[PDB]
């Protein structure tokens, strides 16, 4: 029940530590002391990424699955972040959803 507050490109998020370390992701690396992380005076963990889909990322780490968006752009936007945070399961789902739109 240890909590964490993240500032993802101006997007403010509150989440638990277990969620951030529940899967083998780059976020798990941050909150286990394997990579240098920057924090402001407010105690917010700063991340230089768009937080547009970050809530969706947290849902995947938390629940293990999430309903994906419909448009090819948003799937692309989500896929980009899933790749940045190294969330293997979500990247695959986004890839399958994208190839399904290509058919056709
Ligand atoms: Cl579309």
Residue numbers in the entry: 40 to 143
The authors write:
KCTD13 is a critical mediator of RhoA degradation and brain development, with gene copy number variations leading to changes in brain size and associated psychiatric disorders. Our crystal structures of KCTD10 and KCTD13 represent the first structures of family members from clade C. Unexpectedly, both proteins crystallized as two-fold symmetric tetramers revealing a different complex architecture to other KCTD families characterized to date. These structures were also notably distinct from the four-fold rotationally symmetric tetramer of the Kv4.3 BTB domain. A second interface is additionally evident in the tetrameric structures of KCTD10 and KCTD13 as visualized by an antiparallel arrangement of two β1–β2 hairpins. Interestingly, KCTD10 and KCTD13 also exhibited retention times and MALS scattering that were consistent with mixtures of monomers and dimers, indicating that these crystallographic tetramers were not stable in solution at lower protein concentrations (<50 µM monomer concentration compared with ∼750 µM used in SAXS experiments). However, KCTD10 and KCTD13 were both dissociated in solution at lower protein concentrations, demonstrating that their BTB domain interfaces were weak, as also apparent for SHKBP1. This likely explains how Cul3 addition can drive the reassembly of these proteins into 5 : 5 heterodecamers. A rather different architecture might be expected for the BTB domain of KCTD13, which crystallized as a two-fold symmetric tetramer. This protein was prone to aggregation and produced a heterogeneous sample upon mixing with Cul3. SAXS experiments using this sample produced a scattering curve fitting the same 5 : 5 heterodecamer structural model as the KCTD17-Cul3 and SHKBP1-Cul3 complexes.
